[PDB]
Design a protein around this ligand. Structure first.
Ligand code: 1UI
Ligand code: 1UI
Ligand code: PRO
Ligand code: PRO
Ligand code: CA
Ligand code: CA
Ligand code: CA
Ligand code: CA
Ligand code: CL
Ligand code: CL
Ligand code: CL
Ligand code: CL
Ligand code: CL
Ligand code: CL
Ligand code: ZN
Ligand code: ZN
Lengths: 493, 487
């Protein structure tokens, strides 16, 4: 059984849950983790939903090399200056030096965009809308944490190039909403949509959009997905130019977006919904939504496992994902425990009394509530229960966010509420340095709550729909500049 | 259209087809290639079929790290010695030199098997059947060739551990059959199942089963998929051990297999079926099976007639969708009909569906088969049926053509002179073989590019007459072995 407790040692509870649920195995190279089938299946459920959605938008899947030349890596100065200290460099094969060191992709702008420059020669050659599912490497020497901050991670990155800013601007928001659907409709996690501040925005892009999620267990917020408008900052460096019908002789730079989402998702799903029995899966991504365990003679034993398989096939035929744990090797209760740790939404108990009274027992994982269900009603009732679990999870999580995201209009209120464990929308002047000073003084003036994290606030996002509307001539919390917008600040992952 | 001929310079033809069908772009780093969506789609078709099949076998997908440590990498000494000259090494991040060089996976035995040791505590913990779709790197400095021989490629690698040799041996043949089905039912390419000679087997394994394919245009064979019985060679090194259920205290080492399939498939599909018109897609993997091109839309035609025309194309598109034919309707304004014929012929779309104004007014259409070029006029009401029939018939005939190729280019020979210029005939030869490595090196050296072993076929063309001597003459033949020139 799981014995670590979430409300105490969050990090050890995280370790124990992600290992005992068999989602994650440790590797002998720090910051790289083994994604076992139980986690990978969640990634695939995401993969399937998102791939369908971007296909409806004209995006096509492809695969670009993992290595980058130095010369191409340094064409956009802002971008490479941001990523350079964390780029893994391959320098030899065997004992033989390469001709020239090659970089492993931290992100694939500099891999893809020379190809885009090749493929664009006329207005009719745009848009280009490419996506790939691949790994990238970002070799930070800070302490890694499974799913959340790792040095190799699986992700998808989409890269689109348009002839007009309007097309591009349209796609940035479409994609961001899709990410919000991934979080809220699949992982049952509510998120805040907004723009990044100048400080936090993607180096080399015009503006970045983001969804933020709140982990109430640590009081911290984490960026769940991101979608950037790069504008013409990359096309002018890689010469992605077309020559217009309307505009003779004048080279036109493509307008570009890139957008990304990673297995960080799974980590967030653990931190929000997980409890002290283990993992809790939302039904829409759970590898197995219903697990059938036989409970409690010889003819009776064979007929019992046949009834379990009856339920298995019945559920299979209604697109409920289902496993029959029919091993002679472990108790009923050990299976209860194993599948509770793995977070299966419904446990299906079938014992001979229930088997001959034509019924069964359904145990919900989120609440623990046990129901007796008539055999006849399985396909119906379990579907309903599955549906109700998903809603329940989302509802609980949303009630958390709403109670932890409040407004403060002065620095002192912001400080007190932020040390209270919440994330705060404050009037903000926008300037990078203001954000630095915010970070510095919220760390300096922090009144430490028991077990609370000791760090400064960062900006999370500028919400599209702020809680309040910035009253006219409001100063920023810095006092000295007029506020430009309400910004969501908090302590971050 | 396309200019280079396949029968002349095969390599120039090949580069032209793979770029002009928008499958492959070149990267500024030699040996790595961009799989554009036309190619990636084929890979995803192969993925869907194989993923489903190995799911049925009990294999689950995972993802293991791309980096392996120096210590773990050399634990099985044979395998590491085979791959070391071509392992890429990461030595720094930014400017800071790493404390230890870390390696990029060339294959993943030495990433996964320490975890397998962690996960096999008891006999109940077996079998372990994991597979992953990922990229690997084999930084060889020989001349690359897209799809076939590349420094980085996508593949699947399945790694499985069992408590007995019997279920391991079972799975090896099962996976080899799946690979044969990918080649023959999906890509419409016939292959030859066999075992690698002692020389050509996976280093650190006990035996390697393989499917070999034949590119007739160069006279060369190539290994299309492989499936190894690693035996106990890796479990004795990474200590993957379980206690015998019946003998208390005695530990047993797991028996393991690994099997792999790469994007080389697409390259083979290009070499066997491609022609001087361009790429040729087997309907079963074709991203697009039918393309609907409206013709006749000159400016003289009425807006009434133009909108009726494209509406009729949309009718066809939805009706083929209604029967699970993968149809694109290319209704674009800016490109000409001839430009579209060429575009989609180069990409090798199996059927082109031309609907012009007159055709519409006679409730009929023109279907053009990519492979042979026949134009069939077809009544409107029979679309869904007839198009289905043609798609089937394309796949069949592609396979049939290739198969006859194979059967004429694979012949028996019992002596090395016949072997020698049957081989310089542009063919592959089955010869009686002693199996010894000295003699394999000898056959390579004599046959000069010299000939290499390909496989010891499950089903040889002829049975060995007893006392048959190997072609060395010095020793007696152990088995008919398929030899030839190789990719
Ligand atoms: C504040 O500094 C840190 C503090 N503590 C630890 C680290 C750290 C430690 C490591 F050992 C390795 C790393 C490198 N990995 C990552 O930076 C990272 C970023 C993301 N990100 C970033 C935003 C994004 C979204 N949405 C973008 C789409 C991409 C998304 O998912 C996802 C993952 C799995 N990993 C960082 C860094
Ligand atoms: C006589 O030798 C050579 C001749 N000419 C060129 C090279 C060479 C040149 C390079 F620039 C890079 C490389 C490295 N890549 C590969 O070796 C390779 C092997 C396979 N393989 C090997 C067998 C297999 C099957 N079926 C196994 C499943 C795995 C399968 O698909 C597939 C791919 C795409 N790449 C080799 C080597
Ligand atoms: O790393 C990023 O944030 C962007 C989005 C995906 C690719 N590059
Ligand atoms: O590369 C090979 O040949 C084996 C089988 C696939 C993974 N490793
Ligand atoms: Ca950085
Ligand atoms: Ca206090
Ligand atoms: Ca100022
Ligand atoms: Ca070698
Ligand atoms: Cl525990
Ligand atoms: Cl090199
Ligand atoms: Cl919003
Ligand atoms: Cl639901
Ligand atoms: Cl809660
Ligand atoms: Cl290091
Ligand atoms: Zn300010
Ligand atoms: Zn011999």
């Amino acid at each position: 059984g799981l014995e670590a407790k979430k409300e105490e040692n969050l990090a050890d509870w995280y370790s124990q849950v992600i290992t005992k649920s068999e989602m994650i195995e440790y590797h002998d190279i720090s910051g790289c983790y083994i994604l076992r089938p139980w986690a990978y299946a969640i990634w695939e459920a995401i993969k399937d939903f998102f791939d369908a959605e971007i296909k409806k938008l004209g995006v096509e899947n492809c695969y670009f090399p993992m290595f980058v030349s130095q010369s191409a890596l340094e064409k956009e100065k802002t971008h490479v200056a941001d990523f350079a200290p964390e780029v893994a460099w391959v320098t030899r094969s065997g004992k033989t030096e390469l001709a020239e060191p090659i970089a492993i992709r931290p992100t694939s702008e500099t891999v893809m965009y020379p190809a885009y420059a090749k493929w664009v020669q006329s207005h009719r050659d745009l848009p280009i809308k490419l996506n790939q599912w691949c790994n990238v490497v970002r070799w930070e020497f800070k302490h890694p944490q499974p799913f959340l901050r790792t040095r190799e991670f699986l992700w998808q990155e989409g890269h689109s190039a348009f002839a007009t800013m309007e097309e591009a601007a349209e796609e940035v928001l479409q994609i961001l909403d899709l990410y919000a659907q991934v979080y809220e409709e699949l992982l049952a996690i509510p998120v805040v949509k907004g723009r990044k501040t100048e400080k936090e925005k993607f180096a080399g892009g015009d503006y970045t959009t983001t969804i933020e999620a709140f982990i109430s267990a640590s009081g911290r917020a984490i960026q769940g997905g991101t979608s950037h408008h790069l504008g013409q900052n990359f096309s002018k460096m890689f010469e992605i130019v077309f020559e217009d019908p309307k505009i003779p002789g004048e080279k036109q730079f493509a307008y570009q977006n890139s957008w990304g989402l990673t297995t960080r998702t799974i980590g967030v799903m653990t931190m929000v919904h997980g409890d002290n029995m283990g993992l809790v899966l939302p039904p829409r991504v759970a590898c197995v939504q219903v697990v059938i365990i036989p409970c409690g003679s010889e003819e009776d034993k064979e007929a019992l496992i046949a009834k379990c398989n009856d339920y298995r096939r019945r559920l299979l035929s209604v697109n409920i994902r289902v496993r029959a744990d029919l091993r002679d090797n472990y108790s009923p209760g050990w299976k209860f425990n194993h599948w509770e740790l793995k977070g299966v939404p419904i446990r299906l108990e079938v014992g001979p009394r229930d088997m001959k009274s034509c019924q069964f027992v359904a145990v919900r994982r989120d609440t623990g509530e046990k129901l007796t269900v008539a055999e006849n009603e399985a396909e119906t009732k379990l579907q309903a229960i599955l549906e109700d679990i998903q809603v329940t999870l989302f509802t609980r999580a949303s009630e958390d966010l709403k109670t932890h995201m409040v407004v403060a209009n002065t620095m002192e209120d912001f400080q007190k509420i932020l040390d209270s464990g919440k994330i705060v929308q404050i009037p903000f002047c926008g300037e990078i340095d203001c954000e630095d000073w915010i970070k510095k003084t919220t760390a300096r003036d922090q009144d430490l709550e028991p077990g609370a994290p000791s760090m400064g606030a960062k900006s999370l996002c500028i919400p599209f729909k702020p809680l309040c509307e910035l009253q006219p001539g409001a100063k920023c919390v810095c006092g000295k500049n007029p506020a430009k917008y309400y910004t969501l600040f908090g302590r971050s992952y």
